[PDB]
Enzyme design. Structure first.
Site, PDB file in Angstrom:
ATOM      1  N   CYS A 118      57.508  51.530   5.150  1.00 32.97           N
ATOM      2  CA  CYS A 118      58.674  50.476   5.005  1.00 32.97           C
ATOM      3  C   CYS A 118      59.699  51.669   3.896  1.00 32.97           C
ATOM      4  O   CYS A 118      60.391  50.611   3.375  1.00 32.97           O
ATOM      5  CB  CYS A 118      58.035  49.811   3.641  1.00 32.97           C
ATOM      6  SG  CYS A 118      56.710  49.369   4.776  1.00 32.97           S
TER       7      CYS A 118
ATOM      8  N   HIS B 213      61.968  46.573  -2.303  1.00 35.77           N
ATOM      9  CA  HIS B 213      61.229  45.613  -1.042  1.00 35.77           C
ATOM     10  C   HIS B 213      60.116  45.124  -0.746  1.00 35.77           C
ATOM     11  O   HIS B 213      59.912  44.610  -2.499  1.00 35.77           O
ATOM     12  CB  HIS B 213      59.824  46.954  -0.337  1.00 35.77           C
ATOM     13  CG  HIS B 213      58.887  47.172   1.022  1.00 35.77           C
ATOM     14  ND1 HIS B 213      60.346  46.720   1.595  1.00 35.77           N
ATOM     15  CD2 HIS B 213      57.933  46.613   1.086  1.00 35.77           C
ATOM     16  CE1 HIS B 213      59.410  46.117   2.555  1.00 35.77           C
ATOM     17  NE2 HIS B 213      57.593  46.983   1.789  1.00 35.77           N
TER      18      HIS B 213
ATOM     19  N   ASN C   8      57.190  40.497   4.308  1.00 40.91           N
ATOM     20  CA  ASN C   8      57.365  42.126   4.601  1.00 40.91           C
ATOM     21  C   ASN C   8      58.208  42.815   6.136  1.00 40.91           C
ATOM     22  O   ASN C   8      57.014  42.865   7.025  1.00 40.91           O
ATOM     23  CB  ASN C   8      55.895  42.449   4.579  1.00 40.91           C
ATOM     24  CG  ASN C   8      56.461  44.037   4.410  1.00 40.91           C
ATOM     25  OD1 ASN C   8      57.490  45.067   4.732  1.00 40.91           O
ATOM     26  ND2 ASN C   8      55.176  44.668   4.317  1.00 40.91           N
TER      27      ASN C   8
HETATM   28  C1  COA Z   1      47.501  42.977   0.740  1.00 40.12           C
HETATM   29  C2  COA Z   1      47.644  41.797  -0.029  1.00 40.12           C
HETATM   30  C3  COA Z   1      48.327  40.900  -0.052  1.00 40.12           C
HETATM   31  C4  COA Z   1      45.904  41.538  -0.296  1.00 40.12           C
HETATM   32  O1  COA Z   1      46.093  40.869  -1.707  1.00 40.12           O
HETATM   33  P1  COA Z   1      45.236  41.241  -2.742  1.00 40.12           P
HETATM   34  O2  COA Z   1      45.477  40.573  -4.393  1.00 40.12           O
HETATM   35  O3  COA Z   1      45.176  42.684  -2.539  1.00 40.12           O
HETATM   36  O4  COA Z   1      43.421  40.534  -2.689  1.00 40.12           O
HETATM   37  P2  COA Z   1      42.362  40.932  -2.233  1.00 40.12           P
HETATM   38  O5  COA Z   1      42.864  41.791  -1.321  1.00 40.12           O
HETATM   39  O6  COA Z   1      41.868  41.758  -3.842  1.00 40.12           O
HETATM   40  O7  COA Z   1      41.424  40.200  -2.029  1.00 40.12           O
HETATM   41  C5  COA Z   1      42.150  38.538  -2.279  1.00 40.12           C
HETATM   42  C6  COA Z   1      40.659  37.654  -1.768  1.00 40.12           C
HETATM   43  O8  COA Z   1      41.047  37.002  -1.112  1.00 40.12           O
HETATM   44  C7  COA Z   1      40.371  37.224   0.511  1.00 40.12           C
HETATM   45  N1  COA Z   1      41.129  37.350   1.550  1.00 40.12           N
HETATM   46  C8  COA Z   1      42.393  37.860   1.852  1.00 40.12           C
HETATM   47  N2  COA Z   1      43.653  38.573   2.955  1.00 40.12           N
HETATM   48  C9  COA Z   1      43.590  36.592   3.297  1.00 40.12           C
HETATM   49  C10 COA Z   1      44.376  35.232   3.363  1.00 40.12           C
HETATM   50  N3  COA Z   1      44.435  35.728   4.751  1.00 40.12           N
HETATM   51  N4  COA Z   1      43.509  34.078   3.065  1.00 40.12           N
HETATM   52  C11 COA Z   1      42.504  34.014   2.391  1.00 40.12           C
HETATM   53  N5  COA Z   1      41.565  35.208   1.197  1.00 40.12           N
HETATM   54  C12 COA Z   1      42.788  36.171   2.164  1.00 40.12           C
HETATM   55  C13 COA Z   1      39.725  38.719  -0.083  1.00 40.12           C
HETATM   56  O9  COA Z   1      38.586  38.913   1.733  1.00 40.12           O
HETATM   57  C14 COA Z   1      38.991  38.379  -1.485  1.00 40.12           C
HETATM   58  O10 COA Z   1      38.290  37.596  -1.275  1.00 40.12           O
HETATM   59  P3  COA Z   1      36.668  37.738  -1.936  1.00 40.12           P
HETATM   60  O11 COA Z   1      37.227  38.534  -3.304  1.00 40.12           O
HETATM   61  O12 COA Z   1      35.311  37.056  -2.009  1.00 40.12           O
HETATM   62  O13 COA Z   1      35.799  38.741  -1.110  1.00 40.12           O
HETATM   63  C15 COA Z   1      48.162  42.693  -1.258  1.00 40.12           C
HETATM   64  O14 COA Z   1      47.099  43.880  -1.535  1.00 40.12           O
HETATM   65  C16 COA Z   1      49.232  43.372  -1.119  1.00 40.12           C
HETATM   66  O15 COA Z   1      50.324  43.027  -0.443  1.00 40.12           O
HETATM   67  N6  COA Z   1      48.845  45.252  -1.115  1.00 40.12           N
HETATM   68  C17 COA Z   1      50.163  45.386  -1.273  1.00 40.12           C
HETATM   69  C18 COA Z   1      50.872  45.785   0.808  1.00 40.12           C
HETATM   70  C19 COA Z   1      52.159  45.924  -0.045  1.00 40.12           C
HETATM   71  O16 COA Z   1      52.491  47.263  -0.765  1.00 40.12           O
HETATM   72  N7  COA Z   1      53.059  46.321   1.568  1.00 40.12           N
HETATM   73  C20 COA Z   1      53.064  47.525   2.903  1.00 40.12           C
HETATM   74  C21 COA Z   1      52.710  47.277   3.193  1.00 40.12           C
HETATM   75  S1  COA Z   1      52.918  47.351   4.937  1.00 40.12           S
END
Ligand code: COA
Ligand code: COA
Lengths: 311, 311
Positions: A111, A236, A266
């Protein structure tokens, strides 16, 4: 000084809404919006590959720059989803554009790739080596998404953005930049043996929410400017919560940060130039504006640029 | 001026002889030798990937350069066979080397990749941006070879070569260069849907036998030198007949052209630095020597550098 002469993009027509995704995996429009900010993201057709998107973006950028493909000295394409490993996307569009005198390579920094490419182009121009460098960020993330994995399938979209880089006048042009990486984080975001993206979302989030604001302050500083001097921030477009941390670090108003993550999701190396076109088309970026761009990607790569818009 | 501070390589232990290959496909030691010059080529182990080979080459180059990984500003890796698309090889070795301040990208220009990387590093150094740039050419071609296709399986081998690029004194350093490409030739050399290399051998031969000598004369010219001034020629090591055409164009004696194709075959981006180490270890290249390097690769990419050896 090297600056940006023109910009263009290609946005795939097909829209994938969060309710579309509610049938594909166990997710909710509510969860997707609250945790990422995404509402829609575009998906390329099965017969549309990075090369197709890149050439379309490139033509729009050449036209806006008033630069004929014939005059390109170099084509850089930031992607991890080339049609095939070789011929590269850059080689393919060098042909389709008729840029026969240009050299061509693809660069890989996930990215952050567009930032690496623009900075690379700057060095070739400010050396006097080359005059016009085409830089394309293009990604068909849909081709490396496990569409049964909710943790990633609600995050990624397709698209391409492109800029023509070349010498600009007076105060204009790229004032400063930062490129960085941390291979320690390679475990947290990788392409697996199925060509499926695997991510430790929480770990990438923690790293990006710290590094994106710091990279921004670093380029403002190296450009000899203050936070008050920034006219626009183009981060980004991966998570509104990560973007917001950057905005808070720069004490900028909402209206001075590009936000297109809600509509394109993204798109990796394509994300920044896509957002750049959006704000230019909206008239929100003007000649003379100090624009900060900042990107963060897999392998844990990152980059940032301060540019004074105009020629 | 940017020059080469040190060089290193990694040569896989396993040897694949032409008689080994006589059992695998319908070929003959006689045909392979007469048409390519190849007698042996090395093959990486199934648990050895580009990252392993690249870090080994890089350590040897850092040691020879007397440069600590900690002081690297940038790591470029030219490859089309990364362990995985992301994290890149450059990111992985940035971690394994402890080069935490360095940025890292992989670049893709097939067999010309090392030339693109060295020239890219030059621009970053001669701008004053960076001081030390690690450039690695690494390829596990065995991982994208159809080992039942005699037309390609007798051509490719594995390996890695690396150079530390940085400021050098007086007349020393990279005097001139050329990067080029021609996407028209993309049809003649490509990776197919099986991750198998497909080649129109005769067409690539015709193009390379013309372009390699011309790129050589072009860099000699741009460096303000004559054919008589060249002390050594390091061509891409793919076919002794192609190398010989370059030698003839530069009116150089046999002893002033590196030949390692007979022992390593075509190792793509690794080929030139591997040959460079071979001649340095043999004592055939000295401080003050004008060395011409020239490479040609898929996508139809090419590049050449004239360098005055020494620091
Ligand atoms: C990926 C991302 C959106 C997920 O959000 P997050 O706050 O990390 O969420 P978590 O991983 O802590 O999970 C939160 C909860 O949602 C759940 N969850 C994950 N994906 C889900 C989805 N699509 N729908 C519903 N629930 C979801 C998880 O299992 C968790 O449930 P739990 O607490 O019962 O275990 C976020 O972390 C992110 O964007 N990270 C940075 C990535 C980045 O910079 N981009 C580059 C990628 S190429
Ligand atoms: C690939 C290459 C070695 C083949 O040599 P060539 O002179 O082109 O050989 P041709 O393709 O003309 O074929 C000659 C004959 O040998 C045959 N042949 C091809 N591979 C053979 C093999 N491994 N063993 C025996 N015969 C073989 C052909 O079928 C043909 O037989 P035919 O005349 O009865 O049809 C050579 O063209 C080459 O190296 N090209 C440049 C590639 C380059 O620059 N390197 C980059 C690659 S990544």
């Amino acid at each position: 000084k090297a600056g940006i002469l023109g910009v263009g993009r290609y946005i795939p027509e097909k829209v994938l809404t969060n309710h579309d995704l509610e049938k594909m995996v166990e997710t909710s429009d509510e969860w997707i919006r609250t945790r990422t900010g995404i509402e829609e993201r575009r998906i390329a057709a099965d017969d549309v590959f990075s090369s197709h998107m890149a050439v379309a973006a490139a033509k729009n950028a050449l036209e806006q720059a008033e630069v004929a493909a014939e005059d390109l000295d170099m084509i850089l394409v930031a992607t991890v989803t080339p049609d095939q490993s070789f011929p590269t996307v850059s080689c393919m569009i060098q042909e389709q554009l008729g840029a026969k005198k240009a050299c061509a390579m693809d660069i890989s920094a996930a990215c952050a790739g567009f930032m690496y490419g623009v900075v690379t182009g700057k060095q070739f121009i400010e050396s006097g080596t080359y005059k016009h460098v085409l830089v394309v960020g293009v990604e068909k993330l849909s081709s490396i998404t496990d569409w049964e994995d909710r943790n990633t399938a609600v995050l990624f979209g397709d698209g391409a953005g492109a800029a023509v880089v070349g010498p600009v006048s007076d105060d204009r042009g790229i004032l400063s930049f930062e490129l960085g990486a941390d291979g320690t984080g390679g475990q947290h975001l990788y392409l697996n043996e199925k060509r499926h993206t695997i991510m430790n979302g929480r770990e990438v989030f923690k790293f990006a929410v710290r590094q994106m604001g710091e990279s921004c302050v670093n380029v403002i500083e190296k450009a000899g400017l203050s936070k008050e001097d920034v006219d626009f921030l183009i981060p980004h477009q991966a998570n509104i919560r990560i973007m917001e941390a950057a905005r808070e670090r720069l004490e900028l108003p909402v209206e001075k940060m590009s936000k297109t993550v809600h509509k394109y999701g993204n798109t990796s190396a394509a994300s920044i130039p896509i957002s750049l076109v959006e704000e230019l088309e909206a008239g929100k970026i003007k000649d003379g504006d100090v624009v900060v761009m900042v990107g963060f990607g897999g392998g844990l790569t990152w980059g940032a640029i301060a540019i004074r818009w105009g020629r």
